[PDB]
Amino acid sequence: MTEYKLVVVGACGVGKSALTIQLIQNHFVDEYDPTIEDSYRKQVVIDGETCLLDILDTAQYMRTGEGFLCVFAINNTKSFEDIHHYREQIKRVKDSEDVPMVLVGNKCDLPSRTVDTKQAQDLARSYGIPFIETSAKTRQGVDDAFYTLVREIRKHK
Ligand SMILES: Nc1nc2c(ncn2[C@@H]2O[C@H](COP(=O)(O)OP(=O)(O)O)[C@@H](O)[C@H]2O)c(=O)[nH]1
Ligand SMILES: [Mg+2]
Ligand code: NA
């Protein structure tokens, strides 16, 4: 079966771990030690295809990543501001401009929003990447974010 190595990056507190655990374990974590960096697997079906996802939740495996989720939180302007740092890291570690990537705006369940959809869509367009709005709490968008990334890897191959 086809394996996809995915890496989740972004500022502390955006929901990288919550997004990962919701995908893998089907539950929402209200707190998750921010120093734990681990890799997590789930065999899933994406568009009818069975595949293995190896997901590195960051906090010697970044460089082997085939696609990256760049996460910010929609009530965390600072995390949005930091996205360019993580995009550039990824370019450098892959030595490429064309790396499969998805911009994820998480915590969409929260009303105290400060990054609007247009802002984020504009950033995504400046990188040529999809933008997906998620909630790790509700599950909105979660599969779509990871599965879109897999679809970007599929195209890239
Ligand atoms: N309301 C809400 N809280 C979230 C969401 N995702 C994460 N959180 C919370 O935000 C905090 C940080 O999440 P965490 O996954 O540890 O962020 P990380 O540092 O990026 O791994 C925790 O208290 C999570 O419960 C979400 O979509 N909605
Ligand atoms: Mg974490
Ligand atoms: Na503003």
UniProtKB/Swiss-Prot annotation:
Effect of A136T: In OES; somatic mutation; also found in colorectal cancer samples
Keyword Repeat listed: no
Modification N-acetylmethionine, positions: M1
Localization: Cell membrane; Endomembrane system; Cytoplasm, Cytosol
PROSITE patterns, A to Z: RAS
GO cellular component: cytoplasm; cytoplasmic side of plasma membrane; cytosol; endoplasmic reticulum membrane; focal adhesion; Golgi membrane; membrane; mitochondrial outer membrane
Outcome, altering G13R: In pylocytic astrocytoma; somatic mutation; increase activation of the Ras pathway
Entry-annotated residues carrying N-acetylthreonine: T2
Enzyme Commission code: 3.6.5.2
Subunit structure: Interacts with PHLPP. Interacts (active GTP-bound form preferentially) with RGS14. Interacts (when farnesylated) with PDE6D; this promotes dissociation from the cell membrane. Interacts with SOS1. Interacts (when farnesylated) with GPR31. Interacts with RAP1GDS1. Interacts (active GTP-bound form) with both SHOC2 and PP1c (all isoforms) to form a tertiary complex; SHOC2 and PP1c preferably bind M-Ras/MRAS, but they also bind K-Ras/KRAS, N-Ras/NRAS and H-Ras/HRAS. Interacts (GTP-bound form) with MAPKAP1/SIN1; inhibiting K-Ras/KRAS activity.
Functional description taken from the UniProt entry: Ras proteins bind GDP/GTP and possess intrinsic GTPase activity. Plays an important role in the regulation of cell proliferation. Plays a role in promoting oncogenic events by inducing transcriptional silencing of tumor suppressor genes (TSGs) in colorectal cancer (CRC) cells in a ZNF304-dependent manner.
Record's protein name: GTPase KRas
